[PDB]
Structures are given as structure tokens and as C-alpha cells.
Amino acid sequence: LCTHLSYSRSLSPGKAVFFYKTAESDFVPLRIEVAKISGQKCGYTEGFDANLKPKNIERYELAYSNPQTIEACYVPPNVDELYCRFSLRVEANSMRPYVCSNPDVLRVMIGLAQAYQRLGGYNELARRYSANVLRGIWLWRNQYTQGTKIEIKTSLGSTYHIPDARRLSWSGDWPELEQKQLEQLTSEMAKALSQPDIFWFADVTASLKTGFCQEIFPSQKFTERPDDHSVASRQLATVECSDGQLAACINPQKIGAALQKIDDWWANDADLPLRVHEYGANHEALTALRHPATGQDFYHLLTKAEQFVTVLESSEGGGVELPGEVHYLMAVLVKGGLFQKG
């Protein structure tokens, strides 16, 4: 192909904030607190050296405590509902390369995006993204509630409401008056993703029914180990409110990673879906599912466009003929990045 090729990102979210209501004011932030604790002396190198060779210490030396400083966050007594919200904008921005160093490569990438659009296929991507919003998986470790409600508004005037999100699976069929809203939402998004000159903007709120003083899990900061012992080892992310107070939040890219978890196209065995990645990275197992050695990765597939366009053009469309390799590639172009040295 060519020395330089790249796309920017087409689907971008905001920062999510936690808050609650009172009888006296409509918006009170949830906030974090800091505290000293007494820890344990446990684990390897604490008692063993090399490969299971005990080291020489006295019996009493492990009964001592290990103090630490952490930040933490809890819902205060007597709050019945906790609320969380974020904004979302979607642009039809995978139709054109941000940069390209070769006119012959450029005309081909354009041909492909269009050949795909008219046969169907944006619906498929929209259905998958839509499902992840309405399921609620973007709450990560805070999904364990006594009841979760999700509400969405858009710039076109529509409103959607899931009376209880706790049971919607990735694989399966949704209850009536829920399955239907998934279809309607899919239509708005499928268009926003591919047709330009449409402004679309969404506002997603949810509510969590909680326990008496339940623990809450906001995003964590990346830090250096302090050398002071007066500074926290585990620091949490907050956002500044319009009134000057700070509140617990979830970072944009953490919301984003959840929304794009849609890849169950690998190895012809769906399992659970992966975060889209050029090499099929699997963070839980610390490995990769589309190792270059298999021929299944993005970079091998990027060179078969001429063959794919030929098929797309020869196909009738409107059926189930689109192959995994074409869908995969379109999903990667949506999460744009650097595809150079080709």
C-alpha cells in the first residue's frame, strides 16, 4: 500500500458523574474521602526467597502490621437512589482517511466503504453498539444493584426507557417493548454512523438502587509511588462541578472501552466479545487471539480489499452473505488509528 494512512475516531463520549437528590436541592455530588489503615504482611518475598527457600527471620516478625494510606468512597446513610450520567456524540467519520500518501490507495479505501454501505452492514454495527448502551455494561464493577433503570434522550426528539436493565444478555432475545426499542435506537445510530451532515447528540442517564452504605467504584489514577508516607497509594478520579466542589467520576476512555466491546467474530466460536484491537488482545488472560502467526489480524486483512470489493460488488446484498473479515475491518476503521508502513 503506502507509507502513511490513518483515520481518526468516529464515536466519542464524555466524563460520567455520580450524584444524588435531596428534598432541599436537585444536584448533590458524591464525594471521596481519605484514610489510614493497618495492613497485613503476606505474600512471597515476605517469607520465602529464591524458589521456595525460606529466609531467616524470627517467628514474631510476621505478626506485625503493615500500615497503608488509601482513598475510598461510600454512599452516606439514608440515600435511596444514586444517579450517574454522560453525553455522547457520533460522527460519520470513517468515510475518509485523515491522511493518505497515495492516491491509488485512497480511491480504493473510498470504494470499499461505499460498496459496504449500500448492501447493509451499518445496521449490524449499530445493533451491537446499541445493545451495549441499553445493557448497562459501562458501569463496570458497579452493576451489582437491587435494580437499575436506563433512560436516553436524543437531538431528534426520541426518548428510550429500559424499566430494568439487570437481565439483558449479549446472546438471547429481549422481552417485548424492550426488543422494540432496540430496533428503533439501531435506526438512529446506523444513520449517524454513515450519513454526513446530520448532527446527532445523545444524553444517557441511569439510576442505581443501592444498599445502606454501599461502596462505589470510580476510575483510578495512574501514579508514582510516593516517598513521603503521608500521600495516598490509591488515588481516585474526580470532576470539578460548576459550584467548585469535587465529585467521583468515570473517565471518558473507560466508558468508551465498554461501548466498543463487540467482537465475537474470532475463531468461529463466539464465546464472550472482545474489545476491538488490531491483534485481538485479551487482557484477562494476558494474551492475543489474532496473533500475526495465524493470518487473522488486521494487517494481513488490510491487503485483501481488492478481493472484498470485488465480492461486494458481485453480491446481490440484503442477505446474510457479508463475511467476518469484512465486518471486522469496518469495525477497526471505526475505532480509527495509525495504519502506516503498508
Binding site: 507509507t3 453525553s87 500518501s101 445523545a202 501514579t223 470539578e240 471518558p252
Partner: protein
């Protein structure tokens, strides 16, 4: 005494060696060993022994090939290719740059030449000017040669070195191609586009490290992992480099805009208000998008900036694991590397002076929709959003009257800031220190770039011609809403709008 090593460091004031050339050769040669092996830099015997080792000296002579005036690797050790040696650009009265500083060189190649590079690349004051050992020997400076032969060097060994030492400084002063890990940005110049690549000035950064500590300026520190892999100065400073820190004291009308994670580090020298080159950039990408929607010619003469909220965010981003541990037969993924930056969240309004060339204009609802569509999603490296939907009002209004527009603007909250252009011309950091001591409204800002060469065709350029440049440091004023309520619409529309050139 460790103070001798401090005074010979790249971040310290230069010291005189006139009449001491003999001990200067001894100390400078002794610096090529690890600190653990040397009880003193003053032992003549060790120096006479080190000098006889042609291999040790040969390894030292080889480092000369990568001495530079500007450092293409500074922000990112991954950049690979040739060195850059250029005389400082002509002085611009309104810009702080290397133009007002004397000639100095530094070193940065494979990270294992930290000690061996010190024999020729260490500067000092001599005959009341700034020089170093390589220059005095290449220029055939007899006093240094007489001392060097006296310390045990054979005349024949010196006659050969003068040639090889000179040869290493006679070529490879400009890169052949643009390196794949360098920065590239493009703007209009003389009616067409040109790609600009910035680079950090060695002389300018080294001076700043001394001035902020001596003049007691507001500053912070940026960390670098593996200092030996970035350069002479960063290594000498232990991976911690000081920068200035000057935060703010906090017609088409765009209201309520929110930016997440904006880059708060304008240039490698200054933290504070985001680089103005980025806003000029934004105005234009917005103009091009609108022009592809409306058949009529549309053009932006000026752009204004207002600050309602400013919040600094601590910490740093973790890179995506985009790099395989090994190219083949390995199923492990590694992290490319880590950088130390600064970020903030903004809330701001813009007032753009929009002009339509055609006699008949399109003041219609359709155009207001197209103005909402054309709005970019990216700003200053962060993410840009409109005001939230549940509380939406008309955030995109248009005025064709200065009286109505000024009247509405006078109503803004008292705790915000307008940013105005400054009048003062500054040529050094010391002049900036005095100007900042006297005012309370004055802040340094990044303003643009200064060229090192004329635009040329060069392999690796994204589009058309390519040029190298250094960052331009200038200033701006922070004005309270109360001051313009009194100044009047006359002063506001004359002074309150910014432009390029």
C-alpha cells in the same frame, strides 16, 4: 569537591580556564571514567595514563559525530536519524527565542557515551568567549596543543587527530529525510500550505534551568525515564527538568463549550494557557467544514477567547499495548513507553468575526443548522462538546450590530477572564521576569513558530514543502469583565480580537 563537577555541568554558568590549560586537560580527561573509580579529577598521573590509551581516546573522538545545536529526540527517545546544527534565527522584537543567545552544543546518540562524550563536548570560557576542547584543537590553538603534547601526547598522534576531529564536524548537519516519529503540522504561508516540524533549542533550555532558580520564578518539573537515552542535559539533571508555570487568574457567538483533557503544556518551556497556534488552527478547520456545506465564499478575519472555568488534572495517560514483545513466535504484548505531560478541563466562549464576500447573504435557519454540523469534535488535543441537551438554549447566535452584541457581553460573570494581546516587546527571560514582577495581568503564552530554514521539498513530508522551526514564546493580558464594562465598545472591538500575521 563535587562543586567542580557542578560548575562544569551543562546547566551551570560557564567558568574561565585562561592560564590553567594544563589542569583543564587533566580534569576534562579524568571526567571520562565512572565516579566510583576516581578519588580526584586533579591527579596528573591518571591523566597521563588515560592519554596513552589510543582506544579510550578513539572511543571519545567518535562521540563528536553527534554533537548538535538543536535536539530532534528531546520529547521522545524513539526518534531515529541524523543530528541538526543551525545558527540562531534573526531576532524578532516581539519574540523570546535563541536569537539573543551565544553559540553552544550538546550530545545525544546511543545512551552509553555519558562519560566518554565529556572530553570534547564540555564547554568553558576562554579568551573571554564561549568555546570547548574540540573547537580549540580543530582551529589549531597552540596554547592547548603545547599543554597536550607536554602531558605525553606524541606530535604525530596530534597531527592525525586534528584531521579526524575536524572531519567529524564537517558534514551531516541537516537530516536527509523526515524521521517517522517526528511531529508534522500544516498552516497557510504566502497563499499556500507548508508543513512545520518544531525542535527544542539546547542553548535556550539550558539557560532557563538556571534563571528560574536564581530569579525565583513560578515553575514545576517534568520527569524522563532512562535520562541517558534523551540527552546530555536531561541526564545531568537526573531526569527532572524545570519549566515555567503561569496559570490564568480564574459576528458569530459560540456559548457554553466544554473541553475534556486539553493539553495544558503549550511548549516544552511553559505550562499555562493552551497554545494560541491551536485556536487559530481550530478556527480554520471549522471554516473549511462550513465552506463545503454553503456554496457562497465565507471567511474569518479574527477570533476572540474568553475563560469561565480552568481545572488542572493530575497524573498521566497509560498507552494502549500496540507493540508485540517480539515480531514472530511470541504471544505477549508490551507497552510502547510512558511520557510526562499536563492536562486540564476548560469552559470557554468564542466570538468569531464572520464575513461573506457575495453581495447577497444567507441569514437563515438552514445556515444555523450547518454552523452546528461544521463544528469540530477535537480541540487542543482534547474532546469538545456543546452544552448539555436537557438545558439547551441557542448556543450558536449571529449578530450584525456591535451595540446589541457588546451590551449582551457586558453581562458576563465577574470571576471569568478575557485574554487580550500585549504591547510589550521582550527579548530574554530576565526582561520577562521584570515585566511579570511589575504587572499582575501579564502572562507568557505560546504564539507560534520561528523558521530555521526556507521551505524545501523533503522526503517524508505529509503535504507539499517542509520546514524546521523553534517555538516562539510571547505574552498576553488577562482582563476582568468589569474592566471592559467601563472601557466601552470602541476599545473592545479594536483591541479584543486576535489574527495571524
Amino acid at each position: 569537591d563535587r562543586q567542580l563537577r557542578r560548575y562544569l555541568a551543562p546547566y551551570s554558568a560557564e567558568i574561565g580556564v585562561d592560564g590553567a590549560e594544563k589542569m583543564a586537560l587533566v580534569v576534562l580527561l579524568n571526567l571520562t571514567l565512572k565516579r566510583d573509580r576516581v578519588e580526584s579529577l586533579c591527579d596528573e598521573g591518571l591523566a597521563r595514563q588515560l592519554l596513552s590509551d589510543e582506544g579510550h581516546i578513539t572511543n571519545c573522538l567518535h562521540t563528536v559525530r553527534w554533537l548538535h545545536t538543536h535536539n530532534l529526540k528531546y520529547p521522545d527517545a524513539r526518534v531515529s536519524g541524523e543530528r541538526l546544527i543551525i545558527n540562531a534565527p534573526p531576532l524578532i522584537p516581539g519574540v523570546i527565542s535563541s536569537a539573543g543567545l551565544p553559540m553552544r552544543m550538546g550530545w545525544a546518540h546511543d545512551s552509553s557515551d555519558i562519560n566518554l562524550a565529556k572530553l570534547f563536548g564540555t564547554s568553558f570560557r576562554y579568551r573571554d568567549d564561549s568555546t570547548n576542547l574540540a573547537l580549540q584543537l580543530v582551529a589549531r590553538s597552540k596554547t592547548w596543543e603545547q599543554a597536550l603534547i607536554g602531558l605525553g601526547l606524541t606530535q604525530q598522534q596530534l597531527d592525525i587527530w586534528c584531521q579526524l576531529l575536524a572531519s567529524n564536524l564537517e558534514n551531516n548537519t541537516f537530516p536527509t529525510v523526515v524521521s517517522p516519529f517526528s511531529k508534522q503540522v500544516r498552516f497557510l504561508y504566502q497563499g499556500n500550505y507548508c508543513v512545520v516540524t518544531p525542535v527544542v533549542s539546547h542553548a535556550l533550555l539550558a539557560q532557563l534551568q538556571n534563571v528560574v532558580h536564581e530569579k525565583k520564578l513560578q515553575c514545576t518539573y517534568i520527569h524522563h525515564d532512562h535520562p541517558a537515552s534523551v540527552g546530555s542535559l536531561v541526564g545531568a539533571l537526573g531526569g527532572k527538568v524545570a519549566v515555567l508555570d503561569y496559570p490564568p487568574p480564574v459576528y458569530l457567538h459560540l456559548s457554553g463549550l466544554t473541553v475534556y483533557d486539553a493539553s495544558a503544556l503549550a511548549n516544552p518551556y511553559l505550562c499555562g494557557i493552551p497554545s494560541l497556534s491551536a485556536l487559530a488552527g481550530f478556527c480554520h478547520d471549522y471554516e473549511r467544514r462550513l465552506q463545503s456545506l454553503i456554496g457562497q465564499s465565507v471567511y474569518f478575519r479574527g477570533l476572540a477567547w474568553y475563560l469561565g472555568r480552568y481545572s488542572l488534572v493530575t497524573g498521566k495517560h497509560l498507552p494502549e499495548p500496540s507493540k508485540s514483545a517480539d515480531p514472530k513466535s511470541v504471544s505477549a504484548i508490551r507497552r510502547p513507553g510512558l511520557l510526562d505531560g499536563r492536562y486540564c478541563d476548560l469552559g470557554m466562549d468564542l466570538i468569531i468575526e464572520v464575513h461573506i464576500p457575495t453581495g447577497g447573504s444567507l441569514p437563515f435557519t438552514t445556515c444555523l443548522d450547518l454552523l452546528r454540523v461544521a463544528l469540530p469534535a477535537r480541540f487542543a488535543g482534547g474532546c469538545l462538546h456543546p452544552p448539555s441537551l436537557y438545558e439547551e438554549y441557542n448556543w450558536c447566535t449571529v449578530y450584525q450590530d456591535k451595540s446589541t452584541l457588546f451590551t449582551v457581553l457586558s453581562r458576563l460573570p465577574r470571576y471569568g477572564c478575557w485574554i487580550y494581546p500585549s504591547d510589550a516587546d521582550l527579548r530574554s527571560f530576565e526582561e520577562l521576569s521584570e515585566a511579570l514582577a511589575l504587572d499582575r495581568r501579564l502572562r507568557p503564552v505560546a504564539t507560534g513558530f520561528v523558521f530555521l530554514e526556507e521551505p524545501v521539498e523533503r522526503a517524508g513530508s505529509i503535504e507539499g514543502q517542509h520546514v524546521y522551526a523553534e517555538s516562539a514564546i510571547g505574552t498576553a493580558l488577562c482582563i476582568n469583565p468589569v474592566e471592559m464594562r467601563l472601557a466601552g465598545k470602541k476599545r473592545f472591538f479594536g483591541a479584543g480580537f486576535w489574527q495571524l500575521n
